Amino acid sequence: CAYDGARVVLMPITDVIHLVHGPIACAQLYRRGFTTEMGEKKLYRAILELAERYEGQAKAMFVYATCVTAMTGDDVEAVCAAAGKKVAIPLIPVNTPIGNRLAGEVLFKHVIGTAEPPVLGEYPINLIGEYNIAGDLWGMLPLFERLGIQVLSCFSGDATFEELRYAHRAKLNIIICSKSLTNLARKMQKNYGMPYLEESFYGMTDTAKALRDIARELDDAVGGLEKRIMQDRVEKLLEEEEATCRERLAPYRARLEGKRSVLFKTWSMVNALRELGVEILALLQVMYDKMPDLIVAGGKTKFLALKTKTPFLDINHGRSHPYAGYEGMVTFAKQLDLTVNNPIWPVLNAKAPWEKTEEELTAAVALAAGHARACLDEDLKDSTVKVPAKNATVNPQKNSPALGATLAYLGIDQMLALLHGCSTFIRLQLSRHFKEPVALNSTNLKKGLKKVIEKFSPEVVGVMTSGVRSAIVHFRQEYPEHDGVPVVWASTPDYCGSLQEGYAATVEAIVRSVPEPGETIPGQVTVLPGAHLTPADVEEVRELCEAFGLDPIIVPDIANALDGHIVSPLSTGGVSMARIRQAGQSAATLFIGDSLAKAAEAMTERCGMPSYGFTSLTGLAQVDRFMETLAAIAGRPIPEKFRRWRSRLMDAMVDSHYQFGLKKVTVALEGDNLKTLVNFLAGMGCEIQAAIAATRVRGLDGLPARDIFVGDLEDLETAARGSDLIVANSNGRQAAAKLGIKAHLRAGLPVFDRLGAHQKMWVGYRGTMNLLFETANLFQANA
Amino acid sequence: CAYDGARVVLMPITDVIHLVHGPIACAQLYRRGFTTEMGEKKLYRAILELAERYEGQAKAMFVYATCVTAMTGDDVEAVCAAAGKKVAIPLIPVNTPIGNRLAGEVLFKHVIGTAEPPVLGEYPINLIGEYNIAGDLWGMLPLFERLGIQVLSCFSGDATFEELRYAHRAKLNIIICSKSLTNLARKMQKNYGMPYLEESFYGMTDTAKALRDIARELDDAVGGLEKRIMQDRVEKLLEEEEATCRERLAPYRARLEGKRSVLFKTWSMVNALRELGVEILALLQVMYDKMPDLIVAGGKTKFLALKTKTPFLDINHGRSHPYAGYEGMVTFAKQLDLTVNNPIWPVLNAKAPWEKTEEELTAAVALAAGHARACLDEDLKDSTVKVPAKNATVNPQKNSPALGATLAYLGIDQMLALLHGCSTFIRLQLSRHFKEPVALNSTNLKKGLKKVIEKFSPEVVGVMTSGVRSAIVHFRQEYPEHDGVPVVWASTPDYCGSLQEGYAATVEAIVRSVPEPGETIPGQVTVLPGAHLTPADVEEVRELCEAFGLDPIIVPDIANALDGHIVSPLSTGGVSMARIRQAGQSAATLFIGDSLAKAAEAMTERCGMPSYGFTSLTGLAQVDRFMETLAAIAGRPIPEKFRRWRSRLMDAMVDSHYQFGLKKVTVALEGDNLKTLVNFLAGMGCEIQAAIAATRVRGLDGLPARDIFVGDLEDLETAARGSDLIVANSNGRQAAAKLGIKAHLRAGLPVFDRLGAHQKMWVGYRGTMNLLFETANLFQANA
């Protein structure tokens, strides 16, 4: 067609109303499209009304005829003549009588020459064909400003109508490709005596030729070749800018050496890639034997290239970054390094769990089985992580271990949690995170224990002390009516730990006391979830285990107690005592979190069950290991729903790795959650500036972070400077607001400022997808 | 204990560093807590360091001794003496030698009297015991300013240390409850000669007594009772403010008349409730016979009251709204009307699907069965919704019907979608919403049809025209090798519709052509999903149907095709042709969306299957009807997982109705999605300002909105003024940024600015919970 050319050239004008006579089919005010209802009188009406409504914000109005209306035959010239004398904002008719002819012709006949420019320097130039795609003209404007050259008119870029009306007084037309306006260049040449130069501004060499030719012709026009001023000035600028851009490109040269690319202007991108040291080789199997590292078909064939599981780069009208000039090609190299050196590609090209050979699956299962002994063999004395050397701590993210002990006792059904008004503070915090009632009756010892067990008739009593066995045996002695009720006694050794240490200690105490050994029940697995798992994650873990045909006994089960559910002074909803007792007959023990390793071993030496450990269930490889271990335990193949979900997560990772790449993130959480989220973010391409841990835990030095320290949330604001994302609890809204970081991901406990924190599922393929999309949208909204 | 009183009184001071010697257990700079590591030398070190670091932002430092340290016996007076001479920011020791004694005593001995006030008017007063809880002092400060009285010191409110050091020069102490500082009031009385008045500022009557007594005593102190100025001024202000507050309370009086409340200061809240016309009557069955409408136990017994399925109100230190003064009690009435007149309570107190009698379930199933005939019997000629009277449309949210036809053809496996370069625009938009390849090859007719069917070997061809049967029978005639391949021909009648009309038309065309009638297969249900459902919703619908033991045949199935999945020029992943053919033997037909009703009837008269219709699957009652219909079709009871999820959704609705209440929302979507979201938001308590629909659809006038019109996204910015939330597609980021609305919920198509839009599940109990939490967090972040 023809109106498509006139559209793509004239619609980019940003201070004009574009009226499109006819249907939507076939079809900052530049973002206001104006379409007439399904007609020359109606177009008269629309012209009048749009002029009156958008007066003061519009400087002109373009009336485009479309395929449909041209068939109707309504003469847009007639309505222009019959309507312009009423509203005086200039109306330009674009009629049917190379689509870029029509554009150049209407532009000369009606737009160019209607206003003498306000400021006409000694070096005005007109750039014809610059669409300012993601600021490619913006990378060249400072160079032209430094050179002393004036851009009087940029056609189809940040083009104001007034700027376009000045093109009559200039000396050089530069056609930045978009050649088909060569007719306009030739026609302004005859009438207005303006030489035209067809230049490309993509690449060092082509930019050099462009600037040299421009300096030459403007030296002819202004002054003479003799006394060349522009030639010397361009030589000087060229030298300095080339030096600076080589110096800035060297780091990216080092990272992008020896990589192989397939290319499917063509030359400009070629030589740019060759400069960066990328060998251009030139259909799945031909790629397999090609082993390409990059696909630079910048075409709209994207989605195919993305699904080929290879890094892909796009050089077209759809790019969202400037590639023109020295800064533009620095950006080009940066985006290349982002998309090619991303950590996701080796993970994505790894073998799926269902296509691994039996030997590899056996090795992975063996690693999962040895996780517990690996954590226990690590001893913290050799840790290089820094002990906090402060004296006064401010903003302490270190919660009390009694909070974790309460969280674990809350997952057991009909539990009386006893602490021995100073206990209130635990109740309010846990309630506010969970928006749920919690029972923490606190405490003569035997008398009170009697009192409670009669009043509430519990089937288990949870006693936690920091810093008595005879007293408990005394209570049992004085009254054997209550002998049946078990008492679980948990101790945290230094009142120097957080929620995680208390949770681990009380879970270990439960594991050592309640379960009884017996004959192994096939299909039964004991799951010891970590404190970093929300109730939704525990429910999802149960569902994943049940999909494999296994019976999950989860100790503790906060997924039904401290989750939204709809009265006794005991805790209800958790795992019953019969289930905890029969959990000692399970075939295997699974724990999610390093801190629980000891607890798992507490079972291993008591009965002999194998223990399988997983640091995290977020990230493709970690969920893959979990599924492999579950398939090995159950003896069944992996269900196909999980195969579909893995494919979905792969697609999401490919599509969202552009927002995570080379972003600065500071994470301040407790040990296990910190490990999980730091590993996930580092595997998705983020640069972790600081890793702030609540307490000294195992494996902190191996985290993929620049700075790892044990600290509070004031060290957060001391170290999160320059970060694009902050991951922490709600208390982190301190350090963000101070540092101006608008991206804060709420994780861990407490999270009291947002609703649904305990219902956030970040486990498995769908949970990883949810976390991925949440973080990607945080990056999108704050940029 | 005692340090708890000194803490609750002295810790609110906002410009002082609070150093707490000892453990965290038992324990705007006011939000900086400073705790010493697990010690008088160490406290010396901490004092020095905290003074040097936070210098310029701190005016003093409080060193509190705790239960633990007092047992250690380290004399905080000794460290104060040994450290104050080094850093001169005043250090105040709070030691052990009614917890409010200690507070008043340290305050007099060290804080009060250290600085003459800068500006001491003729009416300074000291308010003792005002904690500025959510701004209760803030509602009284303008009244005191208008009266000409100066608040020289507010103890424990927005209390700056300098403000506290001035209390030595004043005439009246007013104890705003918090009595236990009466010792401080008596002790300032002896030394500084300042009368103390115990007043309450909660309620019209008590505020009146307070202001009268204050005017009297300050008239004694300043001037004489004779020439009373303050008495006359308070009379004047009292009259005007009482009139204004009665006038503002009348609307809330009308809405809160005859309601019954149970109350579990006590008097002040009583009389306030009685003023508002609420009868105070004074344990589930005693409530059943009490039929209470409101529970005003403002205690921390909240969670129990919330779970009693009754409106609950809280009057304590945890309230997040000011209740003092006339404005404070206007706020009280507003919050009462919000929590009592919410639409969620009648829905929440309705019978669950598993506890309904068989007759009620039969009636609900009959309504679901008659949905289709109800929609078809409605004819649009009588609709009161306004036809758009404009001539030029700007920001057209009306997508082309070819977009919907493409969306439906994309859900069929091995489909060649033919339209007869003008077709590109559909491909880019659908791809950008779905980030997935789409195939829309467009078109001598028989020659081209031959060409394609050989090249791509499809099993179905989709032809869509707007505004030939012999030509199709010609292609079949000329070449019977391709006779088997079915051709589906869809027509939208006026090129005056949106995605929804095209989707419905092509689904109706598929239903009339492909399915074949046969013998009814029990357990098979044909699901016709609406265009407003994302692929995740289609997958969840399939899972809900499969949990009941039913086989869902979903036409079309975009959940596997245009969802993240990992090449042919045809569309893959959708529903195969054998399944669509055998869908004509289903026991029942379910359609989600009014626009699909016709399609359902297209089956009903072709074979005879019953059709069940559901406008939306968001909201407790709608999902309840869906589950009842599914249970009736399958003949099985409702699975218990869904019972747990219903309980979770109920809890979430109770907990989140405070953020949705009386909020202003403007929704601009297509018909079915608009109905769904408008009904959900209106049922959760929001005030829908404007309902902007893309096209004229059935049942638009019955929507719970103030203004319903068919319009574009410019009418959105014309009508969304004053709205707290905007629901629309990504193009809505226009009208929000113009109007300053920072809360924009992305719904419908296209959604190109955020990742994971097509993976958003808003169906069923968990989907309703997800939508609820997303909207609640949007309201929380932008307020």
Ligand code: SF4
């Ligand atoms: S309808 Fe016409 S003007 Fe519109 S895109 Fe197609 S051939 Fe071109």
Ligand code: SF4
């Ligand atoms: S430990 Fe002591 S000061 Fe702390 S809350 Fe308990 S009794 Fe009070």
